[PDB]
Amino acid sequence: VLSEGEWQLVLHVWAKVEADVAGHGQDILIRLFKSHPETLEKFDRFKHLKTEAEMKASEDLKKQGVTVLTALGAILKKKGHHEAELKPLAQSHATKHKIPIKYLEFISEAIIHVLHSRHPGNFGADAQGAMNKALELFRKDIAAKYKELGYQG
Numbered sequence: 001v002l003s004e005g006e007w008q009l010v011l012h013v014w015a016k017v018e019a020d021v022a023g024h025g026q027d028i029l030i031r032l033f034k035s036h037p038e039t040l041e042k043f044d045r046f047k048h049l050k051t052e053a054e055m056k057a058s059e060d061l062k063k064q065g066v067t068v069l070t071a072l073g074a075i076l077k078k079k080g081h082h083e084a085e086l087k088p089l090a091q092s093h094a095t096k097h098k099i100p101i102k103y104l105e106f107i108s109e110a111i112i113h114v115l116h117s118r119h120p121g122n123f124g125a126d127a128q129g130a131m132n133k134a135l136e137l138f139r140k141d142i143a144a145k146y147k148e149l150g151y152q153g
């Protein structure tokens with residue numbers, strides 16, 4: 001359980017993300033695909049992309065990044081009261097896309113990397129700790145849902 005102050009650190013950096021969600025989404029998905037290339041193979045619309053430049057030029061990848069961060073943002077703004085938001089997301093990621101918990105770990109690492117890079121004004125150690133806690137809670141609750149749904153994450 002996060003404290004109110006931890007949530008405030010999370011939502012303060014998120015507010016900066018929201019200044020340019022598309023840009024942040026591109027940076028995060030690209031960081032994930034560079035750092036863990038195997039994760040790209042899960043995306044049929046753009047698994048063929050070969051380079052970061054191609055990735056930056058991809059309107060579809062940009063749209064996907066927006067879709068991811070907007071969904072995540074809505075979850076974060078619930079401050080742990082996110083059961084309703086998690087149901088469809090867990091179902092799709094378990095059953096349609098087959099995304100292991102390990103890969104949700106990888107994207108969380110990518111989120112933290114980009115925020116650290118872009119937002120040192122809002123992402124010092126305490127803020128990064130709070131964001132890590134929020135993302136650990138997300139993964140914990142999604143992992144419990146995966147189990148309910150029948151998916152070894």
Ligand code: HEM
Nearest residue numbers: 039042043044045067068071072089092097099103104107
């Ligand atoms: C913060 C973590 C994540 C969030 C909030 C998120 C959110 C979403 C959302 C909202 C969609 C569209 C609706 C849906 O299908 O549920 C989506 C689609 C998808 N997500 Fe994620 N996602 C996350 C992580 C991942 C990761 C790590 C992968 C793969 C390594 C992944 C793979 C997919 C795929 C393959 C689709 C379908 C893309 C397509 O249209 O072809 N997601 N995701």
Ligand SMILES: O=N[O-]
Nearest residue numbers: 002003004005006
């Ligand atoms: O009051 N912040 O943990």
Ligand SMILES: O=N[O-]
Nearest residue numbers: 027030031032034
């Ligand atoms: O885009 N990775 O540093």
Ligand SMILES: O=N[O-]
Nearest residue numbers: 066067068070071
């Ligand atoms: O495409 N925004 O959720």
Ligand SMILES: O=N[O-]
Nearest residue numbers: 082083086141145
């Ligand atoms: O707590 N949401 O599964």
Ligand SMILES: O=N[O-]
Nearest residue numbers: 088091092095096
């Ligand atoms: O449950 N959505 O593919």
Ligand SMILES: O=N[O-]
Nearest residue numbers: 031035109110113
């Ligand atoms: O993408 N994590 O460093």
Ligand SMILES: O=N[O-]
Nearest residue numbers: 123124125126127
């Ligand atoms: O990031 N220094 O607290």
